[PDB]
Design a protein around this motif. Structure first.
Motif: not given
Length: 39
Positions: A36-39
Motif C-alpha cells: 500500500p502507498s499514498k501521496p
C-alpha cells in the motif's frame, strides 16, 4: 463468571474459542516494504 449470586447464563459460552486455531492469513512482513502507498 462475573457474578455468583444471580443465576448463571452465557449463550456465548458454548463458543469458547480458548482452543484457538491457525490464522486465516500469514499476514507476514512484506518482502520489500508494504505494498500500500499514498501521496
Amino acid at each position: 463468571i462475573e457474578v455468583m449470586y444471580p443465576p448463571p447464563y452465557l449463550d456465548n459460552e458454548k463458543s469458547n474459542g480458548t482452543i484457538i486455531h491457525v490464522k486465516g492469513k500469514h499476514l507476514c512482513p512484506s518482502p520489500l516494504f508494504p505494498g500500500p502507498s499514498k501521496p
